[model samples]
Each structure stands twice: as structure tokens, then as C-alpha cells.
Target: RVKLSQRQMQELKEAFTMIDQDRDGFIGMEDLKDMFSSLGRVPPDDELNAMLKECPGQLNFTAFLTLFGEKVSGTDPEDALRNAFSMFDEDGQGFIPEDYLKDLLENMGDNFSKEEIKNVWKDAPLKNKQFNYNKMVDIKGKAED
Candidate 1:
């Protein structure tokens, strides 16, 4: 089980809400692309179209819930979100602080100083919040384009 503070809980809920646009409790490729666009990545239209063509019909709440082995009906979704957040919290600090970005960039052979790294974080649409795997999928898809 994972523990989350109030702020973290809010962020997680916001993440889910953003991905579940249309407020239908399910995520489709368009919603996923919108989430990516919100992160300031304007992927080429052709690429976006291609991706949408290939994506499965939906990524349901149950699929996300299963990642952390939680049943959505009985348990609070917060617990599942907390567990999901924990996977991205490299420092186990209950938050994804800026330092983790530096490590990530460094691993990719991008030599960014602490200040530069912080700048990237500051410019990011989402910073200091848990890095959702679904977000990473969007980023990766954009990168491939």
C-alpha cells in the first residue's frame, strides 16, 4: 500500500480527470493526445493521426487500477493512485521532486546542471507531481514522431 498526502491526492485526481476528458471515466486516444498537448508537446498531425489509428479503443479505469492491484469498487481510488505515484517517486519521498529530472536527463546523456534542470522543470506543464505512466506513453509516442 502507498500513502499520499492531501496535495498528492489532489494531483492524482487531477491527472485522472485530465486523462478522462469528456468526464466519461474512460480514456481514449483523443483524450490521451489532449493530455500530451497540455504538456506543451504539439506532435505532428500526421503522427498524431497515425497513433490514433493504432491505439486500442480505450484504456479504461479498470486497466489503470489493475496496475497497482487494487479493486476500484471497494477500495478508494486514492490508494491505487498512490501506488501508481509511488512507482515514479524515485526518492520514495511521496513526491517527484526536481532532482529526479536531473537524474533522468543525465541517464539520457543530457548534461544539464542543477539550475538548468530546474528551469526545465519550471517550464514543464506538470512539475513536482507524480509522473504518471500514461503520461510517459504520450511523451514516448511524441518522441517517436
Candidate 2:
């Protein structure tokens, strides 16, 4: 089961609002295309069409949220983690800097203390003081079991 934290949900709602250019409570194909293009990914027509097939031509807010959430944190936990880590890895590096990790935890708005963050990463695999996202995902999976 995939669940979104309150913060994640709020972020998604804000994203939806920004994407819905016309403020009509729905997003059209052009809106999606523009959004992806802005992200430096101009999805091919067939791919975009297939995605639209999952919902109606005009995607409502609820439907959009459900689809987005599924894509972000679906049944595959590793995929979800990878997606999240990629966003924070601005340089496209395979690893995240330790300082970035610290900043991320501190700004998460979850009130996670420095000690808690330190404990979480105490046993994590680090390469040159940078965290290996793949290793973190593996460890996360093992811990969940």
C-alpha cells in the first residue's frame, strides 16, 4: 500500500493548481504537455496519448491527483524512492551530498531533529561523503521487511 504524508499531499495539491493554467478545476492535454516540456521532457505523442488513456481527455483535479500519486509512490517502493532522490540530485549525480541530505531533513517540516537524521544515516552507504541512493533504497526495502 502506498500512502502520502500530509506534506506530500499538500505539495501535490499546489502542483495541481499550478498546472491547471485556466483554473477550471481540470487539466487538458496541452497543460500536461507544457508541464512536461518545462521539466525538459517533451514526451512523445504516443506516450502522452497512452497516459491520457488512463483518464478522460479533460482530467479533473481528483483524477489527476490519483494518477500523479500512483506514478510517484505506487506499489514499487524502490521506484518511489528513486523518483524522490532524483528530484533532490540537481546535478544528476548518482549520489546525494551529505549536506543536501541534512538540509532536506531539516526543511522537511516534519520537525525531524539532527540526531534523528544522523541516526537514520548512521549505517547508510556513503561514497566520498555522498549517499548512494540505490543503496539507500535497498536498505529501505530490507528495513520494511
Candidate 3:
């Protein structure tokens, strides 16, 4: 199951309150469309409709929370990491070259420090001049604390 931190849950609750303009305990398509547009991300009708259909177009407070949690949360860490890694692995290979990995880290908008990049490379799961995505996730997860 996907897990949400306490802060994320609290923020979602607050956002739900703000988005429910009429205090009707429900969020309509217009409400979501307006919210997305306000955020400069006006989703296409099909996308919005698809999301609405998930909750059968009736997004009550409880239903909204459930849908948001299920849709937005990461269900599997390894799968998420693999998806991210694939963006840099254009060859469809299961591993990323060391230089490519370094370039990706440097160019990514995350503003990773040179020292951090160095540490990541130094501790990366390198074999045959390529880094293992699964092992990278395992290593990164261990360092999160």
C-alpha cells in the first residue's frame, strides 16, 4: 500500500477545504478545472473527465481523499525509481552508464551539489561501467534517514 506522511494528509485536507468553494462537501468538475487553471495547468477535458469518472464524477470529501491518496501516492518504490531511471536510459538497457548518470544528476533541476553528486557516484551500484537502477534505489533509501 502507498503511504502518506502526516504532513501530506494534513495539507490534502486543507486543500480540499479551500477547493470546496460552496462548502457543499463535494468538488465538482468546474471546481477542479478552475483549480487546475489557477495553477497554470489546465488539463484537457478527457483527462479531467477520466479522473472524474474514477469517482463517478462525484468527488465528495471522503471520496476525494481516497482518490487523491490512491492516485498520487507511490505504490512501489522500486517501480517509481525504475520509471525515473528510464528517462535517462534511452537505450532501453537495464543499466545507466556512469557518465550519463552524472550528467543527469548535474542537469536535473534538483540543484544537486557537486559533492553530493560525487558521493552518489562514489557509492553507486556500478558493475560493467553501468549503474543498477534497483541497487541505486536500495542505496538511496538507506541514506534517507
Candidate 4:
């Protein structure tokens, strides 16, 4: 079984909040679409729809968790996100500090607009003050981008 460090848990919490567009708690196809959209790529609607349809009760916590688990078994997606965040949290502040942000921007190796990086940093939170992991994992239904 995979265990998560405190910092990793924090990162997961943050990523979950960032991806959960509707703020209903759980992430669904629309949430995924919005995440990718924010990154400037809107996947084909048919493909999105198909992925959603392929999973029965696709947006629920269990299903979504399973999907994420498939990507990194022996560990929760939340934990995986925490690891990803670690790459950016340079000062180990349990949050992405400015230096960390700069590192991430530099590593992007692309001409990332300052505005976009600003938005991402400002919008991203290390923890949700009102975090409800269970609710976040269980949320379902369609969401608007």
C-alpha cells in the first residue's frame, strides 16, 4: 500500500480543489475538461463523452478514484499529486512559494505568459479551509466550464 507524507496530502488537497471546477467537491468529466481547457486544450467532445460513458457512474468518488489509481496504483491520486507538487514547492513551505513558481515556469521551457502563471499560482491553494475529502471524492453530475 502507498502511504502519503503530510506534504503530499497537502498537495493532493490543493490539486483536488484546483481541478474541482464546480466546487461541488468531486471531479467529473466536465471538471477534467475544464482542467485541460485551462491548460489551453479542449479535448474532442466525443472522446470526452466516450470516456465518461465508459465508466458507469463515472463521476462518483469511487469511480474517479479508481481511474486515478489506475494511473498510479499502490498509491492514491491525491498522493501522486502531492509528489508532483513537491517538484514545485522548493522551499518546502507546504505550499508553492514564488521561487518554486519561478522554477516551474522555467522548467515549462516555454514562453509561459506571466499572466497565466500568476493566475495558476493565485488560484492554487495548498489546502482547502473547508476541505471535505469524502464529499470531494463522491461528487457527481455534469458541470459547466
CA lDDT of each candidate?
A: 0.53, 0.72, 0.69, 0.53
Off by over 4 Å in 2: 68-145
Of the pair 3 and 4, which is ahead by lDDT? 3
Per-prediction CA RMSD (Å): 12.6, 13.4, 12.8, 13.3
Worst 10 residues of 3 by lDDT: 70-79
- Highest TM-score against the true fold, candidate: 2
Kindly list the per-residue Cα lDDT of model 4 for residues 55-114, writing each as its tens digit. 565364445444454434344554454565466544554455555456556566775677
Is candidate 2 or 3 superior in lDDT?
2
The list of candidate 1 runs beyond 4 A from truth reads 1-11, 42-57, 68-145
lDDT of candidate 2 over 69-124, digit per residue (tens): 65555435547778888887876766799887877887765767878877887687
Candidate 2, run of 10 with poorest lDDT: 69-78
State the lDDT of candidate 3 residue by residue for 1-145, as single tens digits.
3365555557677887766575477676677777887778657888878877777557776776677766455544546776887777766665788777777777767767898887776666778888787667766445541
What's the lDDT for candidate 1? 0.53
Could you give me the TM-score of model 4 versus the true structure?
0.37
Best by lDDT: 2
Off by over 4 Å in 4: 2-10, 53-55, 60-62, 74-145
Order the numbered candidates by lDDT, best leading.
Answer: 2, 3, 4, 1
Q: List the residue pairs that clash in candidate 3.
A: none
C-alpha RMSD between model 3 and the true structure:
12.8
What ranges in model 3 sit over 4 Å off?
A: 69-145
